[PDB]
């Protein structure tokens, strides 16, 4: 039995906080984007023929344009401000453990936000070669996780260090694994 | 690019499903419960720093639903092509026996936003402690969604996220066990 | 606390 879907998305794109801001208003019918308002262009543009009549109608409503063109300040920058303290400046400390899966796994879980640097050290010295990662996984509850793996046969008496740098710590976190 | 705030709305016929949500870098800030007509924050503490007047969302949905109807006739009732989900099961943090944890069922890259999802423990349904996100937007205009099941890690137990979607031939069953 | 702002859904042309 057939389905029909309409999507409307107002996207506020922020470059360096609120210095450069772009507004993207998108209408999507069954997975196909048909018409958009891009603050960079300053009027509605049909993406597909489906959306052509909507671009022409909306471009002739002067009030609507005037309003959208100021939304970059009235809407985008406004919401950024309302939400700064619990979105942009949200910080959760990663929980870092190291176990052998040979292959040494560094798990880094429960952190926010998404920018992180994970490094491995064999006896206090870097190991960029042999490093396998899952990539950044978004948990859906405002925490990320990642698992970073090192291919090495562990010779006992050696030290392996998982080093993790993250906006939630001033100096980096290191977990060691010996013998 | 640094950050993205998205006000995302959708309407699906003939199901008559409506959703209105705010997304920050891919995480939900809140969504509007259409039935109870109230703002539901993804994390309870967001309700301290911020408010949203739900009546504005209801208005947008009405318009979205009228737009969809007109748009449906213009496309001569072209229905949406089902796009089946990808499904990954994974845990909150690294699993340990007798230490509490959470199963995450991540459902991604599907369209029409309708799924039916059950967790099975040793082949049988579980619903104790379960929770779920609403449907979340993607840049290719498909959807993501998360299902959560708190559990006590054990050596016997096999778990399944069972996902039903019209884009699939048989329910997709995704294995997880503690090894 | 402080109020989040909304953009209104534009009505597509009738008929």
């Amino acid at each position, epitope marked *: 039995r057939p389905r029909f879907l309409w999507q409307l998305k107002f996207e506020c794109h922020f470059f360096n906080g609120t210095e450069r801001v772009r507004l993207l208003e998108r209408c999507i019918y069954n997975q196909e984007e048909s018409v958009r308002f891009d603050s960079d262009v300053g009027e509605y543009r049909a993406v597909t023929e489906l959306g052509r009549p909507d671009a022409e109608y909306w471009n002739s409503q002067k009030d609507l344009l005037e309003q959208r063109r100021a939304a970059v300040d009235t809407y985008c920058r406004h919401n950024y401000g309302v939400g700064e303290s619990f979105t942009v400046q949200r910080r959760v400390e990663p929980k870092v453990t190291v176990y052998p899966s040979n292959l040494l796994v560094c798990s880094v879980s429960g952190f926010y936000p998404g920018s992180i640097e994970v490094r491995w050290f064999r006896n206090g010295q870097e190991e960029k070669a042999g490093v396998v990662s899952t990539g950044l996984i978004q948990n859906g509850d405002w925490t990320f996780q990642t698992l970073v793996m090192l291919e090495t046969v562990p010779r006992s008496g050696e030290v392996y260090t998982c080093q993790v740098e993250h906006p939630s710590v001033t100096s980096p976190l290191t977990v060691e694994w010996r013998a | 690019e640094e950050h993205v705030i998205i006000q995302a709305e959708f309407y699906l016929n003939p199901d008559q499903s409506g959703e209105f949500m705010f997304d920050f870098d891919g995480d939900e800030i809140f969504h509007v419960d259409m039935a109870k007509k109230e703002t539901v924050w993804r994390l309870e503490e967001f309700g301290r720093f911020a408010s949203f007047e739900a009546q504005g969302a209801l*208005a947008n949905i009405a318009v979205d639903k009228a737009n969809l109807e007109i748009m449906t006739k213009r496309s001569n009732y072209t229905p949406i092509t089902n796009v089946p989900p990808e499904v990954t099961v994974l845990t909150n943090s690294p699993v340990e026996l007798r230490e509490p944890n959470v199963l995450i069922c991540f459902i991604d890259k599907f369209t029409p936003p309708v799924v039916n999802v059950t967790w099975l423990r040793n082949g049988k349904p579980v619903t104790t402690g379960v929770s779920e996100t609403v449907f979340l937007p993607r840049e290719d205009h498909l959807f993501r969604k998360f299902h959560y099941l708190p559990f006590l890690p054990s050596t016997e137990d096999v778990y399944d996220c069972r996902v039903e979607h019209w884009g699939l031939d048989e329910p997709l069953l995704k294995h997880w066990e503690f090894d | 606390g402080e109020l989040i702002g909304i953009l209104n859904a534009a009505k597509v042309p009738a008929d």
Partner: T-cell receptor
Amino acid sequence: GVTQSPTHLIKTRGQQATLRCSPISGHTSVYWYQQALGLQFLLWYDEGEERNRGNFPPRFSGRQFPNYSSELNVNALELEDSALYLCASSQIRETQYFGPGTRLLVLE
Amino acid sequence: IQVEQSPPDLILQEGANSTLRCNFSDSVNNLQWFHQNPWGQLINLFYIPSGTKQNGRLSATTVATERYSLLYISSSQTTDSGVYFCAVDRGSTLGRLYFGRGTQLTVWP
């Protein structure tokens, strides 16, 4: 233009009033405002439905008809209810156009 | 939520120029200026969220980030007499204008 009836109305404390409004043809939204002793917002209708409502007792109530004209109805009138009641139509979040008002006086 | 107008009233002689001001305490999707004649008819002068607009002897400027609007009356005229309102379409509330208290203007010949 937006029209309103009636132009004036006198009412005794405790009676009830019905005010009428027609939006500009093409406009599908209707707004009621009260101007007493700067305007205060009462109610908003679009496509027959109460979309929103200001800070007024349930005594104040209304509705919009399928042809988009609307009725504001006030019920256990008080001396304080004396005001110019203004009606406006518009496309949502665009310019508002106002009718000539109903000048309503409530006396003892 | 709060909308301050200045001044509260004003008397001009025909030909004089002035500036009516409006200050507001939150982000505002759009801002509108009205003239209200003694009978009570409101007339829209400007829909202006940002920038500068001219219509004849009237012009207006809205600076959205700073949250004010100025209304310029060049070469004033007896017919300009009445009350001038800025009203404000608060970005977080759909379908509602919030009015200031007005600036009463009287222009004598």
